[PDB]
Amino acid sequence: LVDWRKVSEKTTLLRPIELKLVPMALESSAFRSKFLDTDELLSYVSWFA
Amino acid sequence: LAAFEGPELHRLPGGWANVGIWILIVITMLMHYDSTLYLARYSEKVVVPTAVVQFGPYRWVRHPIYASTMLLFAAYCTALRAPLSLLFLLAVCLVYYNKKAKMEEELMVESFGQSYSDYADKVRHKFIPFVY
């Protein structure tokens, strides 16, 4: 679903380790879009841990 | 009517039949406390909601404190074994509590707009999970 051409045109000045850590930040910023709380995520994170 | 209808306190059974009652009590107080903690966290003043709440019991039932309070009386009518009173409190509490829910809901739909609209689209079931 991701148009990787735009992403590559957005990461031109970076390096291969940053090219590897790009999808992590993309998922973080994509989950940033919705309206959600903190404490439930701590609860589920702790339970799954 | 619940005290009148229910059997005498020594005739009602115990053992593994009184373990469901404890389950109902604990689940009621969990749901109500979670609903209260979620509702009171987002309000700046005593009752002034800054945003729309859609977490925990709010992602199951649109009015969770009300449902928890009625479920308290339902477990109470289960305790002395009087289902008929349980049904009658279902009727009367549902009527009054739906009236107040309609008033509150129309107020905060007017004051918030699309957010609670799509939230109510997400959770239609207003008091009981997929029963009403």
Side-chain angles (χ1 to χ4, degrees):
Chain A
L1 301 102
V2 187
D3 179 81
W4 300 110
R5 312 313 310 209
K6 183 79 224 74
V7 189
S8 38
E9 296 145 16
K10 275 282 156 63
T11 183
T12 80
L13 68 139
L14 278 312
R15 301 131 280 201
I17 58 151
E18 282 110 6
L19 307 182
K20 294 317 192 182
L21 76 97
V22 156
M24 190 45 218
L26 274 39
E27 295 173 292
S28 292
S29 306
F31 277 144
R32 184 259 300 266
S33 38
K34 289 159 294 316
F35 166 55
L36 81 185
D37 215 319
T38 325
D39 45 352
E40 266 217 329
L41 314 177
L42 288 306
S43 76
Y44 302 139
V45 152
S46 175
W47 182 59
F48 277 122
Chain B
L1 185 128
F4 170 84
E5 225 301 312
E8 282 214 346
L9 258 170
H10 74 298
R11 314 280 309 283
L12 49 89
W16 277 86
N18 289 171
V19 78
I21 294 305
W22 277 106
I23 292 157
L24 268 298
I25 288 197
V26 295
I27 69 150
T28 42
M29 56 47 51
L30 329 182
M31 304 341 281
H32 157 266
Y33 212 37
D34 291 337
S35 319
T36 281
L37 191 57
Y38 286 163
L39 185 56
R41 172 262 160 275
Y42 282 117
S43 39
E44 175 46 67
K45 287 149 189 34
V46 156
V47 281
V48 173
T50 52
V52 156
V53 311
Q54 38 195 316
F55 320 102
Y58 281 102
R59 78 186 59 256
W60 297 84
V61 158
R62 254 185 285 123
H63 304 95
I65 278 163
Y66 303 153
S68 81
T69 281
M70 172 46 179
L71 200 56
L72 167 76
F73 320 110
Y76 142 83
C77 299
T78 316
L80 203 43
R81 335 292 157 183
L84 200 136
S85 43
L86 180 142
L87 302 189
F88 292 356
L89 327 183
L90 268 180
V92 55
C93 209
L94 258 192
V95 162
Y96 173 79
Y97 253 64
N98 171 40
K99 162 178 181 186
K100 196 196 181 176
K102 286 307 180 57
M103 291 325 88
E104 172 139 1
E105 195 162 43
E106 77 87 42
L107 175 67
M108 47 176 197
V109 166
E110 166 262 358
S111 174
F112 277 71
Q114 195 35 249
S115 58
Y116 195 85
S117 276
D118 58 64
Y119 168 66
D121 298 316
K122 203 176 68 172
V123 289
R124 156 60 203 84
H125 306 298
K126 188 174 40 215
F127 277 131
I128 314 181
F130 50 84
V131 180
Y132 186 88

